[PDB]
Amino acid sequence: VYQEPTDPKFPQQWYLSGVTQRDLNVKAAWAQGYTGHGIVVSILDDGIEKNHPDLAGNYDPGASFDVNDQDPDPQPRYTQMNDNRHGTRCAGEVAAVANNGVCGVGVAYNARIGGVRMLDGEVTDAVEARSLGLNPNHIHIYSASWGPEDDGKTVDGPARLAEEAFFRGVSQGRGGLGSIFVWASGNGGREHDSCNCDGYTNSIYTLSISSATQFGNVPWYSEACSSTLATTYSSGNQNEKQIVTTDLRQKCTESHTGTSASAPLAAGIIALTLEANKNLTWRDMQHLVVQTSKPAHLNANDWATNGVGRKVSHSYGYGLLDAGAMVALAQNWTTVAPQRKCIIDILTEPKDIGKRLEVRKTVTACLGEPNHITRLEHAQARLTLSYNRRGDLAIHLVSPMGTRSTLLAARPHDYSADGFNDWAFMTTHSWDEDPSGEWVLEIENTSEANNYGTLTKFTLVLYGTASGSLVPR
Template sequence: MASSLFPLHVIVFVLTLPSAHPLLQLSSPLPAPTCEPGHSWAVQLRWGLEQEGGSLDELANQVAREAGMESHGQIGHLNGHYLLCRVQDEEGDPRVPGEVLGAHPNVLWHSQEGILRRAKRAMTFNDPQYPSQWHLVSLRSVHGMDINVTGVWERDITGAGVTVVVVDDGVQHTLEDIQPNYCPEGSYDLNSNDPDPMPHPDTRNDNHHGTRCAGEIAAAPNNSFCAVGVAYGSRVAGIRVLDGPLTDSMEAVAFNKHYQINDVYSCSWGPDDDGRTVDGPHPLGKAALQHGVIAGRKGFGSIFVVASGNGGQYNDNCNYDGYANSIYTVTVGAVDENGRKPFYAEECASMLAVTFSSGGRHLRSIVTSDWSLQHASGCTEGHTGTSAAAPLAAGMVALMLQARPCLSWRDIQHIITYTATRYDTEADWEMNGAGFHHSHKHGFGLLNAWRLVNAAKVWESVPFLVSYQSPILKELETIPAYPNKLTLTWNVTAAALRQSGMQTLEHVSVTVTITHPRRGNLEIVLLCPSGMTSLIGARGGGHEWAVPAQ
């Protein structure tokens, strides 16, 4: 045996207890005493000073015999508490247990036991399609393949007091699922310039999109109709803006409409997902997003949730979507019911997180409310794409805001970063300098309602936003052919950071101007001091990019 570097001291404690005092006796846990319902009495015994020797067990037996009962032993670990049961074969016994126990000098307390009615606090709804909402409650064996929301509901966190507005092609607010939670004060029709966002049927029958998104967020429970929303206690408004020509000014109005009533803006749309289009909010839209996070929600900031896009099959990249790469938005991508990136999902460095939606042909889509116009049923099992993912995220944000109404728009982004779960080991995960894993496919991971809400409850607000801007870097050089590359470096000094007041890094926004005959051959990578790389300009586009903190 190897010798120890330090002397070994063994200290032995010997505990002696007077056996004459049963309340201090140490014993192994007793099996739970049982009795026929209606024939059992619980008693608390008093060890009198006149007692000599013996034990509480013996006293319990004595009291039981005097009352025409049997002692079934101590109740759990409650010293001095015993269960006494009526002897079944002594039906003619004139003794009344309650009277005997009430008069006994060694009985401090007694009570005849009855059957207690207790209900399991599991969430049950009579909405016919609720069992098919796998994204809310997954009954399959794959662990974690739902948004983990039922435990939040059981604690009465349902989005109460929060309003989510769906900026889309309208919301059928007369639908059974929508009407109980509809918020007319937060709604407007910018296409028809009136307060009613009711969708207008068209020849293509495709103006059901906003109603489906609204149902995902706030469909009312227990109305025997269709399904249940993620934040079924929240209110839902509609801004109809996508059913007609859209201008920069209309978009700006939509982003700030009723922004002291509407807390969360759910936007399941963006530029064309064709792999060629580079577009985003124009000057007024950009200004409205910035104004919303500054002045909306009484200064805590409007929460803008946007879908990352469905151009994956065309190699589209959401970095070329100016809504997705804005620092003011929560960019949400999609995974299928197995937690894998679907064929349509786009990748980008600006992805914040993902949640569930449709997948391949044999995988399930999202069950939600649907319009009842054009002879539709008011319910669908076929809501798909990142259009279905963004409203789920918006609903989860509503749950967070009920738990902690004073969260700022940046607090929401931080909490998502901290609580999103990394699950797909085949994704391109990299660890940044702050210790967070990020993937261009999944952002910081899968949204989890339980983790989001519990983090929100104890969250301390982040400091005021400050920024640092480098000078314009000019490099009048020819971009070499692959595998060579042109590198531009900028060093942020400690003195510059002190002057700016920055303590933590949340976003890096990069604007580039490049002259090149074939944009699709360009690839732009942001290399961070930590060694992490962000592909901010994938082959196929180029314009302006913003990325999560590295």
């Protein structure tokens, strides 16, 4: 009975539907009757062309604001260079109108779509906070790709107002179920960037997404890190297709690219999922992504099986999003138990790093206490250390179940002598593992240089629950 969209560029949207099996399985969701009706998504970027012929029908002024000029109208600023086209491109990925003879379609082509104009000006902590915190009882899902420069030498994350916006969002947003913040993991591949150094994507409050090329490879621009959860398709080399969407000046583009094109596709899939079950919490949604995402046919040299039998990669997280599987699993999903937090201060004395430092600690994970965790979600190693050349460091963390997470890869351009100041390196790779037992932190100098420094604090922070586990995969 389901008739797929007739839009002129829909056949070019290879990632939505293909006979190849190299797609996001979105048609299967549409055929189950989920197209995003009733869900509200906001693009946090450089504005949205609200009168675009493929956006106007789904546009929601209630999901929109202009923080740069402080007015309700997120219309992009037009220039000869068309610099402010990115938000419009991303909006079309989520919610371009279907069956209207214009361009292609959004993943959630019946969802409502808005945009916050907030990148076209000075992006302060306050600007970020007011964008993240926009109308949080109306907007369900936020999509963003901003954060620290992808130069492979920066370490930065949300300051106080923005971090407060994240906690207010997931705590009180969406009727207490929590705002869904979908994030792109970064575009710094060429600079050998490592995305746990980006505190926005490295946050537990953001659902972080990386890219795969059409032929199933890790694109040139990709950043690997343990905080990433999953993957959607985006651009690659010049023989591979790219993302097809709405463009500035009421046009259509077939050349939208980069990890920033992956996050909106994920946001669209999450919109379909929320339509299938409006009662899903922000943590429920991350569980669904972990359980349903698919490694198959994604090529990486670092695929590893974790303690509960799931394949995970630092390039891809748990793999490609599967919209059909997401909406199926959502429908009778049982809400996860309240989030517990177990704080373990590991060191009894500072430790010289030298050539290599290994710190082993056996933990009980708050045994006997209300924060006892037997079922991990996110884990953080919050590290404070000095070092003379930061980018020469590589840091790994091994769970009791033997899952080795890369917290930090060598960053050749990072010459900083500033070290890390309580930086909360996060891994998703031990999700659903029992965190009781021996954890191992490894810090090593990857260079030949005689480097030096000291680890002064290592807090292992465990999040999760103590109930509801599945039989391991």
